Amino acid sequence: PTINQLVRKGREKVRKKSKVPALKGAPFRRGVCTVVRTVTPKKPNSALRKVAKVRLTSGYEVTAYIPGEGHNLQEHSVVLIRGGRVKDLPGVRYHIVRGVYDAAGVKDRKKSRSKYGTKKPKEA
Amino acid sequence: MLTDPIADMLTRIRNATRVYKESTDVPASRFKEEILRILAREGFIKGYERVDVDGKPYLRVYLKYGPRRQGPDPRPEQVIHHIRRISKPGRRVYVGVKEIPRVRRGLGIAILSTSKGVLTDREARKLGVGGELICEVW
RNA sequence: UAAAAAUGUUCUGGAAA
RNA sequence: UUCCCGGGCCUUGUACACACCGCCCGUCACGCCAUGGGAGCGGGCUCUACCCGAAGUCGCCGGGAGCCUACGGGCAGGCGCCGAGGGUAGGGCCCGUGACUGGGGCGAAGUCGUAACAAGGUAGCUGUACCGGAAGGUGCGGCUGGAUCACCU
RNA sequence: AGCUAGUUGGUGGGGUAAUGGCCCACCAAGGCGACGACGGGUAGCCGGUCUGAGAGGAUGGCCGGCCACAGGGGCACUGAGACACGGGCCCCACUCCUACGGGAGGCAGCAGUUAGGAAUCUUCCGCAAUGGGCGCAAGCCUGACGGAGCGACGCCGCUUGGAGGAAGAAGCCCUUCGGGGUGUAAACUCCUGAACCCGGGACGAAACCCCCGACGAGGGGACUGACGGUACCGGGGUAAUAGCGCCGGCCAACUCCGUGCCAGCAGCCGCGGUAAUACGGAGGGCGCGAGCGUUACCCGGAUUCACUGGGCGUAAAGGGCGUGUAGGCGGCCUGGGGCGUCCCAUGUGAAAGACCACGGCUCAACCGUGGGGGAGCGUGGGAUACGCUCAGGCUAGACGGUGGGAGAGGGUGGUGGAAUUCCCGGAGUAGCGGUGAAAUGCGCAGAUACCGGGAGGAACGCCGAUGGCGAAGGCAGCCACCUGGUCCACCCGUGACGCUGAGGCGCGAAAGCGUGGGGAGCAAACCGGAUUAGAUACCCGGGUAGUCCACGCCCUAAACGAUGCGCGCUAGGUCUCUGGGUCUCCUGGGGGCCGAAGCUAACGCGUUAAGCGCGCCGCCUGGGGAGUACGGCCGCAAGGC
Secondary structure, three states: OOHHHHHHOOOOOOOOOOOOOOOOOOOEEEEEEEEEEEEOOOOOOOOOEEEEEEEEOOOOEEEEEOOOOOOOOOOOOEEEEEEOOOOOOOOOOEEEOOOEOOEOOOOOOOOOHHHHOOOOOOOO | OOOOHHHHHHHHHHHHHOOOOOEEEEEOOHHHHHHHHHHHHOOOEEEEEEEEEOOEEEEEEEEOEOOOOOOOOOOOOEOOOOEEEOOEOOEOOEEOOOOOOOHHHHOOEEEEEEOOEEEEHHHHHOOOOOEEEEEEEO
């Protein structure tokens, strides 16, 4: 563009879109599950991913994913939602923080327990 | 109607050296002589001279090159490797003596117009003056 | 430049290398 | 040696490369998500007009009617302008909603055909126009990002 | 996208500390806006802070400056100052008392509660210090402030031990069952001694005040410590915490078992379907450590909005084309001005922060002292190359003159022949037509084929193209009139009059729309016949709109060179159209092909640039969603922008 055109119109700034609204700026957000189901993954994959549709405090109702093997959540359990989408589950854009509120930790978890809200076990 | 007499001249010089011509003509204008006079003093050209092309006043620039080379493509290297117009009429450029650029870490010359005449970066620097930044050459 | 010539459909999802 | 089957060499087109037993288009059916329209309803903000109009400052008056007086005055009082706020009516912007409805994205193995990619078996694409389950067909015009031999420059 | 009545100006008043339509009479019609008024959304601004090579981008918490507010809203009083946070009046909402007529309050002060939230502290001690108000002073008040408390929330420092100690215990893990690994690790032996224990124990505090001297200068004296019996020093003194992430690639780190597209992992590519360094455990390893990971947001990387520092022939990207408004840009010589620009001096640029040097807490973090930068902007003085401006001059750009040229450029009116169809008249008879093959269809009510005549509509064969004209769309028989563009020669005139161009205006194939006319051929739709699994197609027979004209609309396209306009510069070869020549060939304008240099991802482009430069405009910013929706403007509609 000629300088005269830049003077007249100038460059336009980016303006990035939040990959995680519904959180409304917070790191996490609380919510209540209105349905804890089991969805089938995207294409290359096959499985029964455990996901729950959560009614957020921030006035949003979205579906989040339940990490780890086996959970204890049922309709009406209160959970703490967190950034993080799951590639297979289309529409699933947030994870459930394990080990906060009604979301128990992952029983018998020995590695990276911090990520699955499970306490360091006593040495037998 | 030549929107920019100077850039034109810089380009004539450029387009010519690129085909290894011996000399090139250019419409004459005092301010232009100043530029050439500098490229002359600085060694980029062999020199200029006022000539006459079919009734009108032109300047004839004598181009300079290096020696023929070995291998494929013996074409000699240019003395005027680069010669770009800095300030254009589309957007002028002026610099304070403290903002005068250094062309090619020294092996390059910058030409500027000042109240004290058309001088090189080096001179202007040793004169405490700034001005319009005509072009840079190396 | 000018330029004729064929009735007849379709092959599940991943992965080869 | 035209044709059918398999195969050599060159060339041509290609959206194929799991390499035509390839690729791939659109409707229909099911699920999810977001979104437009929709009798309209519920809000938020905001503009106009008019009605009632607190406190208060500022103008009258202060008299058939008080209190003070440093007796030219002053205070309390009464009238008015303005005025927060309500109120009635009608606009403007925005948001949320609404039976029903349009199309859209996405979703391991659904139904129908086969439009396109190789004169893809009617060269293709294209503006428009009419038509048809659907891809699309046809009309008019346009483009080459299409066209063997010969053959003309 | 238009906004404005106290609106814009004036005159005289009111008002104020003071200017002012701040307010009020009266008069005038103005004021503002694409240089973005008005409106909507969001937001306290700055010093600074984070990031960044920088230019930038993001941000505005703590500290410092300014502004604004004190439950919501209005108002005035007192006063040097407030239209006043712990003053007042009034209305409102809500909280509480009431003897029901009126009363009381406002933590966005300190601390604490509750609600909301992912989440953010003690109803601490002291006025000892600094600072403030009042007081002659003594001194009083001070939730400012100085401190302590709680929270790994952050940064800095410290500890969980040090030296010995096996061709190397056990246990666990692998294993080519020899052995390898954890591993000097442990044990064990010496050694130091975080904590804790006893003892001593601050700096911060010297002035107000008293005394000699004048209650001045100067000298002397006394009181005063919240933190705290804390820091710190001395002596004594026990081996005294370790976790979190990760190990398919990017990215440092691999093996066994379990699992079998399950369970699960996943920042991106992707792992898992019975030999998984990718899931889960284990052994092992790597990284970091009182922390380590996760999520969220900002800068970076992202020259991925490109000023520095990008692009548009085919990748996303040249507007369908003109004409032109604002705007941007501007050939050669000379002089005045000195606005831009540049230089010197000077004022400002608070402090803190940042940087640098040196110090103080044992270091560091913190912290003090000093030092050096600095654009901007004000002022005075100066320069004049370039830009600008004024003036004079110039002819190389551009325009005009005169004489010529080519052309399907445009508009209007005429008019010519070939052919198709229908009609009339001849003549003639059994089929014609159509296809891959046929059938529908036309025909013995006389078709097809043939001759003559007529009517009517549309398009113009050969010439004819590697052609020409036009800004584009586009233009083709011939003739006449009306009219545009353009090229050459002579170099005659003017004297920079130029280039581009957001909007605006005009033009704009085909299809389509309106009124009227016209209708031969062709032909969407439509009807038949075939074909086929079907056949709303392709092939065949029919056929309406339409195709044609007038006037008015519509405004799209593969409106294409998918290549905006103008100017200068950078080998040639060859064919061709058109003009001039001292017409071997040269020179100007145009159309093609091949190719120097250069350019390009490549294909290719290459004096008809996609090369090298300058000016101006338009446009691009991953793929879908989608040229869709909503809004607006246009349109009769279809639709268009």
